Design a protein around this ligand. Structure first.
Ligand SMILES: [Ca+2]
Ligand SMILES: [Ca+2]
Length: 803
């Protein structure tokens, strides 16, 4: 269990080493340091200012760049957007006192998807404070006077550095093609000016690559004395056809609006290649963020991948085929019986990397952020070691770095059963999972795949599966799931596809089948009220076969049938027969399924007496609001309803119900509605402990359909995929039983879900009909608001809907 980690959240990390300490510098002015690439310590204060750790008075220091983007403008309204910086010691930088040597930080500011710039600051010491020097590349400028929403920044090109560059003779003049006909920024072909990367070339010259979606990635030579670009000064094309622009530089990747950002280029003197890393997709859990790799013999390109395809796209096309996909979404999924606990180690949207290539030892490290399965938008930094393969491509270790190095590996330490992940070319929210194969002593591969393998020398790995040869290495890795150092491989084929392998411990089929049986647990089976998940597989393709002693209670697949209200609970046995090879084992679970129980009526605001009272007598009456839950001023009239009279909601008014109307996590709500008009997010039934802890029944939700909705800790989308009509009556109802939530329309279940939050227990919530804190009030009639203790039975709901 030896290795220990200490994690930090630094989005878009840029690695740099100062003495023997590693530093990472990310977006949102976050930075952290480590002595070992495993245990990190943050030393920054985010966007705090003044007293900003990295910038001091942030607003004053960087005002130069902030006049164009990234401070309290458009998308940065209310705050700041200082993104994706790069840091490196420039030994030739002439400081303002004439001394030589500074740490330079090139940063992005951005106010929309397109209006951005890159600027830089310098410090003699890596922990700052860094001091502004200049803003050097701008994007999102226009032909004429123009303004984005929530901004009064004149986006005209004359507000950039372009006039002064022209005055210095560094540019002929404005380039017509930077603009569409309407005068707007041509980001089909030219870049978003963010995500800079500074690298030295074979000859010790300095380049900056940058870009993000839009027209793609560009690169510019840079003066080592001052940090300023040495702008091309004229447009042209590279011999192989790539755009050269007088100002933006030389396009080396992307194009035509497609994804691709977080560029990092490394010169490798052992191989004499320039390696180009770039991240595709969107950074969110759902965005399929994935790292790609190309190479060039020249810093200025052409960069190509293992199939010789260009990094620069031929057009507005899917960028999937292009670049070696070195990491996407994956999971070494723990199956029933595996050691450890949890779902296993996997990543979601890993990306925006930097790289540290140690000069002495050739050791190489991919540094990046990632999200995780079942943790939403939470992100931490990861470090994965890389190793040059025999075709001149660094290959990425499957697990995060844990002190390991390349070694002499004996054949006996390799032969065995493996988990195998193939990263493919495709990317999406989907997550890749392991297959199970074996590398056999006779140099074949068997199991889920077939083919061959060899080890050359100490550790080169060659693996050929179905005619594809992947080359890479064998290396020992820390597997945190099993808590062992295990043998592993990583290898890349000539499609630019990476496979990763983790060696499973040797176990007999008897031992595996025993492990599966021990780990197999169905939770509470004495109080069953909804279907059971019954896994049909355990580790290494163990088969779990289920039989029931009585399908009336519960099927072979865990489908339950609750007895009617009034009937006894029914019991049944489920038997798991667990097999692998010729070994078998048995585990019995005794299942008690509970009958339905009727929800009890606890409040009835019927409006039948032309008033706001509760007919059950349990609650005080409703009172009248204005256009919000917490204001007054409105009116309620009473018109002819679906049942008796009904409340008329004019569009400026609502009803405030008593606090605590629901005070539990087992409850239901039922009501009738006749909307005269539809407005988005507008509530009918609304209950809230506060503006970040509420539930709402919404006729036209964010997806344009009726939903049950909760926010903001956590969000929950109870989606129905059913549009409500205006000018007609619709019954709506929902139940919440300790996590289980269901939503009915006109008697029919249209959403069923789990994990639903308990908003109404831990303090008395406010409640209302037709109004909340933000949205247009409901316009129409509402009728028969009924509240319950407990979840309504299906038939109870059909009853209610049945008028
Ligand atoms: Ca970067
Ligand atoms: Ca009524």
């Amino acid at each position: 269990k030896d290795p220990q980690f200490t994690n930090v959240s630094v989005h878009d990390p840029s690695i740099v080493k100062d003495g023997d300490t590693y530093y990472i510098f990310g977006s949102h002015i976050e930075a952290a340091k480590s002595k070992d690439l495993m245990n990190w310590e943050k030393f920054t204060n985010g966007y705090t200012t003044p007293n900003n750790k990295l910038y001091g008075d942030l607003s004053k220091n960087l005002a130069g760049s902030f006049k164009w983007a990234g401070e309290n403008d458009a998308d940065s309204k209310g705050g700041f957007a200082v993104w994706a910086p790069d840091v490196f010691w420039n030994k030739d930088y002439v400081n303002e006192d004439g001394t030589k040597g500074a740490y330079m930080i090139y940063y992005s500011v951005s106010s929309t998807y397109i209006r951005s710039a890159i600027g830089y600051a310098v410090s003699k010491h890596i922990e700052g404070p860094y001091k502004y020097v200049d803003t050097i590349v701008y994007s999102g400028f226009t032909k004429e006077e123009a303004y984005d929403a929530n901004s009064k920044i004149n986006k005209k090109w004359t507000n950039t550095n372009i006039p002064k560059l022209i005055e210095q003779g560094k540019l002929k003049g404005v380039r017509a093609d930077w603009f569409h006909n309407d005068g707007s920024y041509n980001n089909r072909d030219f870049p978003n000016a963010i995500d800079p990367n500074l690298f030295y070339d074979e000859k010790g010259n300095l380049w900056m690559a940058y870009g993000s979606w839009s027209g793609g990635i560009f690169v510019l030579p840079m003066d080592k004395t001052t940090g300023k670009p040495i702008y091309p000064g004229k447009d042209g094309k590279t011999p192989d056809g790539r755009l050269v622009d007088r100002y933006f530089g030389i396009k080396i990747a992307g194009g035509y609006y497609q994804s691709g950002e977080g560029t990092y280029i490394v010169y490798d003197k052992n191989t004499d290649y320039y390696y180009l890393y770039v991240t595709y997709g969107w950074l969110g859990a759902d965005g399929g963020y994935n790292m790609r790799q190309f190479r060039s013999t020249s810093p200025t390109g052409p960069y190509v991948d293992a199939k010789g395809q260009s990094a620069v796209l031929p057009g507005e096309v899917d960028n999937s085929p292009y670049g070696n996909k070195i990491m996407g979404n994956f999971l070494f999924e723990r199956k029933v019986g595996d050691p450890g606990t949890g779902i296993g180690v996997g990543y979601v949207s890993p990306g925006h990397n930097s790289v540290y290539l140690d000069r002495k030892t050739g050791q190489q490290f991919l540094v990046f952020h990632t999200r995780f399965p079942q943790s939403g938008e939470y992100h931490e930094v990861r470090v994965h070691q890389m190793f040059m393969n025999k075709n001149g491509w660094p290959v990425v270790a499957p697990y995060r770095y844990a002190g390991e190095k390349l070694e002499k590996v004996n054949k006996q330490d390799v032969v065995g059963e493996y988990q195998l992940i193939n990263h493919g070319k495709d990317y999406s929210a989907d997550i890749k999972k392991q297959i199970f194969v074996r590398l056999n002593r006779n140099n074949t591969i068997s199991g889920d795949a077939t083919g061959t393998w060899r080890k050359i020398g100490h550790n080169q790995a060659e693996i050929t599966i179905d005619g594809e040869t992947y080359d890479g290495v064998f290396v020992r890795q820390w597997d945190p799931t099993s808590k062992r150092y295990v043998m592993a491989f990583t290898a890349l084929s000539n499609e630019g596809v990476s496979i990763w392998g983790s060696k499973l411990a040797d176990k007999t089929d008897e031992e595996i089948v025993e492990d599966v049986a021990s780990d197999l647990d169905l939770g509470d089976t004495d109080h069953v009220v909804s279907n059971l998940h019954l896994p049909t597989e355990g580790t290494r393709h163990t088969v779990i076969s289920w039989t029931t002693s009585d399908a009336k209670v519960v099927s072979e697949t865990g489908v339950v049938h609750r007895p009617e209200v009034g009937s006894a609970p029914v019991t049944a046995t489920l038997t798991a027969t667990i097999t692998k090879g010729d070994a078998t084992a048995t585990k019995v679970f005794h299942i008690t399924v509970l009958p339905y129980e009727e929800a009890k009526l606890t409040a009835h605001y019927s409006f039948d007496n032309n008033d706001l009272s509760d007919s059950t007598g349990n609650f005080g009456p409703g009172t009248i609001t204005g256009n919000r839950i917490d204001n007054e001023g409105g009116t309620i009239a009473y018109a002819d309803g679906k049942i008796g009279k009904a409340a008329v909601l004019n569009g400026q008014s609502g009803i405030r119900l008593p606090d605590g109307l629901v005070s539990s996590n087992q409850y239901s709500v039922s009501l009738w509605v006749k909307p005269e008009q539809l407005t988005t997010h507008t509530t009918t039934f609304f209950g809230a402990k506060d503006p970040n802890h509420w539930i709402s029944l919404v006729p036209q939700g964010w997806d344009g359909n009726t939903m049950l909705w909760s926010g903001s800790s956590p969000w929950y989308d109870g989606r129905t995929f059913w549009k409500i009509p205006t000018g007609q009556w619709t019954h709506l109802a929902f139940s919440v039983d300790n996590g289980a939530v269901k939503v009915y329309i006109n008697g029919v279940e249209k959403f069923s879900g789990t994990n639903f939050p308990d908003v109404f227990t831990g303090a008395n919530a406010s409640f209302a009909l037709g109004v909340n804190w933000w949205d247009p009030p409901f316009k129409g009639l509402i009728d028969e608001l009924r509240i319950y203790e407990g979840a309504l039975t299906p038939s109870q709901v059909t009853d209610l809907a049945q008028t």
